[PDB]
Design a protein around this ligand. Structure first.
Ligand SMILES: CCCCCCCCO[C@@H]1O[C@H](CO)[C@@H](O)[C@H](O)[C@H]1O
Ligand SMILES: CCCCCCCCO[C@@H]1O[C@H](CO)[C@@H](O)[C@H](O)[C@H]1O
Ligand SMILES: CCCCCCCCO[C@@H]1O[C@H](CO)[C@@H](O)[C@H](O)[C@H]1O
Ligand SMILES: [Zn+2]
Ligand SMILES: [Zn+2]
Ligand SMILES: [Zn+2]
Ligand SMILES: [Zn+2]
Ligand SMILES: [Zn+2]
Lengths: 256, 257, 256, 256, 256
């Protein structure tokens, strides 16, 4: 049912841009929450990364992956604005003559900046719990944040592609089912996949660098490196979202 | 995107609460009691696990603990009973939405809080009578955890409670946005897995923690003035996460003019 | 929604006493099965107890509790007469003016005996499988039946209270959801909670003592010690089922 | 509600026999598929039993049980003819005046033989894969076949009884719910129990022996010993299925 | 309920060829995603194999099977064209007189070549991430591709069969249920069964070899060996898929 799906997608895009043109406050607040949601998932899996790494476990990355489902499940189940997901919706709705190229440009920028705000808000709050004053978890953040800002642009860009392919395909999946359960399971599988395989998610990283740059202990990485990671991964996501999933669902769901 | 339809569902839920309180206090407390005892049953389970595993020196203890805490909020959702931390978002949202007053909110918060506590007290007492926390790893787990929580800076507890309710209320929010019960349970399971393992603080869960520690004859790491210090700051944290975050969010996203 | 549920419970209660006043065969044959169904859960988690204990792992209690779900899941899905569950139904239905004190006591007695007959039959058959001729499993039974029969009264009594709160609250959930899957998930969590936490269920114990008594491989049993545990635990279940859940569901769901 | 189920069963029995009298091809082809489907489950959990026993694991049997769900999940979800299941269905239908005693015997004889053809075909093909040319799995196969063909008749008979009580009770559940998801979860719990507990399924054993015999590695099997196990368990199965489940479902769901 | 299913199947077949006859771009792009989706499943379970292998674990093969569901799940939920699935559909469709032999061979050819386009695309992108420049994963990819290539034709062939009997029987299931969750669960089981059992999947192998050839690590892969495996496995699938499931779902479902 590609036609029915492409239509759903396009409506989604129109609804998004409509919200933005109606209330920037509403759209920013909705995106803020999606960032805090994806971020919560990060906090869970780095807390797991810490516990399991300190204990020298081979299962660390598998378990970290199995436990990330909450990040996207919360976003999908609350109907909040996540930038990575708008990479497919805006483009798919754009090729379908439902939204302009500006519309897409505007939703991407606002959803992005909006997601960042949720991540910064979460960062400060977590930091204030003490839970990263020192120890295995605190360190797991510092090291990870360093690893990522230290990788080749090509490596990130491509990691970013494979990631948003998985994310958007689970979003597409939710558009093609009525089972909120099936929705969640598919999100579970895709995040399990993208997390454990080592792909890069622009928004989830906002929480990673948010907590680092806001933590006292963490001296390891600069703000300039956080921008290099987000930009290289962002571009990667955009490609994997718009140029693969966006264009793909349109091609499969046109009618002449 | 179905925010108006939901903010409505919320604003209605808020009304039914203050309505229930106003027609029968026996009914509102007895409900709040079963909720506290339900959230507490969840603490009995994961603290038993917390004990078996720490005594064995496993690195998976906090992970397995968070995973098993699902029963706490699941019972409360599936029975439709009054939980204080859940009303932080409902009453809050229903208030901003011109459905209930500030007086109603603080009435429901108080009666459900004091109500949940009765649930904990009854549970703890009964749990002690089972003899399961006379001695051993579990007793030691309650004893040690009770002390760690009572001896943390105010700010730490405060923020730990904020992140907790954002998760607890959001799982509730999810339940107002789906007709699948299975979907409801899963999301609760995920949100609880997150807040437990991440090390966040839930006031009504702590009532069973302190209920059991203080009531146990052999567990003295406690201090009632300590349990109060915790329950107050964590509760403050929960209200800020439930009302100022989720409550205010569900409304800002739900209005129309 | 408590009016509908309380009404719903009262109807269940009235059906039970109707079935018993209509056919004692049907009601004992339905109780025997519910006993033998819960008993099956025991045979599983004790076979699991023998293997994990003999090997001495910490997870033993946790795995056992996660595996007991089948016990009450068969009872609910087959729709058969479990004594512990009748503590809430008959209790609430009675308070709601639908059933009489005499009706409650009959349904309580007849399902108890019936459940027991259920376990006796399971025991004999299990004994004949040889699965308990000697080794970890038969040892886990022997060892477990001892401690249960050597615990102070109040301990069992309270343990029985907490058990039937969980067992009945899962039964309650199966009255508040149209999703059969959601039913099974809730039973799962409740049975996981009460098993791993070390609470006492009377019907399940009939199977424990059924095997320990029929198996040649002795025990620190002595029947008299089995009647002591079954009597003290049953009273606990009754209090937890009737006084807590039964009366609780009534108070929340009356109308004036 | 039991006549509404007892009715479903009686209709299921009438349709089974209607199929046999309409196409001995269709009924066999269906039974051979059920047999092969169940065997497929065996191939998985013996591949597991081989991996885990070799490494000396205390979890071996527990993981085996947890993974055997696929066996009956294909037979129920595809609607194919399984002998063990026909014990309760044909039995209950025969007691409810739906089908005759000769009807019950044809269905039983054919489905049984049909299931064997499935196992044989699967057995052959599996051997051709080379996965039993030598090693842990092959050893687990030949080892388990022996132990089974070496146990007293009684043991097998009683194991067969408890095995079918469980396999049939899950088949009953699938008659008592409209949730396909629920149907599966229940099959999962029932097989988990009977596998891990130590009970004997006659059709699953066909594949166990199919492989052991057709397998290039000597044996220690003796085909005359394989028949001993299949007769012992099959009879155990019949009792468990017919006398217990069949008779119980009829008794609980009559109308006078 | 096979008539209705055979009808449903014959319809899928008619739609597939219709799609191909109406737009080669739509069809190939649809097959490109199916291959890439199945490939993502491989990327996941080889990342898992690399980690657990390097840590020397006996559970590795078991954890790989449990984590492969995302492969056929993404495909069934996006409604995309996977060659191994068309072995059954086109077979049953043909025998039921909905499509021709020419129609069949076109669908087979185009999906297979379409799936390969997807493998090659996933390959390039994945290697571009550095996640296989060197290490346990990279070495795992290399090592598995070598084993597969260096295996007798008869072995690969028979494993291709059993693999597709499961891949297809899961597609058959998705045709028989309306529970989307039940569809995923059943796929999860079937992919668990064939991965852990050690069976051979043509399309999954496409990404294995796609990554082993673009990958920097030197090994014993040999292109002539990749074609030898792809061919001998492809065949195996065609047989188990068409000669087994196709013909079976036809025989059980025709009407006279
Ligand atoms: C906290 C306030 C956030 C405001 C974010 C607005 C940033 C807009 O950014 C611009 O928006 C244009 C359309 O308006 C697009 O055409 C441009 O591509 C984009 O850069
Ligand atoms: C047995 C439990 C009794 C609980 C009684 C709680 C009564 C709360 O009463 C409320 O208190 C608020 C302050 O918290 C005030 O702002 C409100 O005006 C007042 O109505
Ligand atoms: C073969 C098994 C037969 C069991 C029949 C049990 C009959 C129980 O009968 C009931 O016993 C109660 C107390 O036990 C009494 O309070 C009731 O008055 C009485 O009807
Ligand atoms: Zn349209
Ligand atoms: Zn309104
Ligand atoms: Zn009424
Ligand atoms: Zn009739
Ligand atoms: Zn037709």
């Amino acid at each position: 049912a590609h036609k029915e799906t492409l239509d759903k997608l396009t409506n989604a895009a129109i609804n998004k841009i409509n919200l933005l043109n109606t209330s920037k406050v509403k759209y920013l607040v909705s995106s803020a929450f999606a960032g805090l949601y994806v971020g919560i998932g990060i906090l869970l899996i780095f807390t797991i990364g810490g516990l399991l790494t300190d204990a020298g476990s081979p299962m660390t990355k598998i378990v970290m992956g199995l436990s990330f489902a909450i990040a996207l499940s919360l976003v999908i189940m609350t109907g909040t604005e996540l930038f990575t997901g708008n990479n497919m919706v805006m483009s798919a709705g754009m090729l379908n003559k439902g939204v302009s190229i500006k519309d897409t440009s505007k939703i991407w920028a606002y959803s992005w900046v909006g997601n960042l705000i949720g991540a910064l808000v979460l960062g400060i709050i977590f930091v204030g719990t003490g839970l990263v004053d020192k120890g295995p978890v605190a360190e797991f953040f510092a090291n990870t944040a360093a690893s990522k800002a230290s990788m080749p642009f090509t490596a990130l860009f491509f990691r970013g592609i494979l990631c948003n392919i998985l994310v958007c395909v689970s979003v597409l999946c939710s558009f093609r089912t009525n089972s909120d359960t099936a929705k969640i399971i598919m999100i579970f599988l895709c995040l399990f996949a993208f997390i454990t395989s080592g792909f890069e998610h622009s928004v989830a990283n906002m929480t990673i660098y948010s907590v680092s740059l806001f933590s006292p202990t963490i001296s390891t990485v600069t703000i300039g490196g956080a921008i290099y990671n987000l930009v290289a991964v962002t571009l990667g996501n955009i490609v994997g979202g718009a140029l693969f999933m966006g264009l793909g669902t349109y091609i499969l769901g046109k009618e002449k």
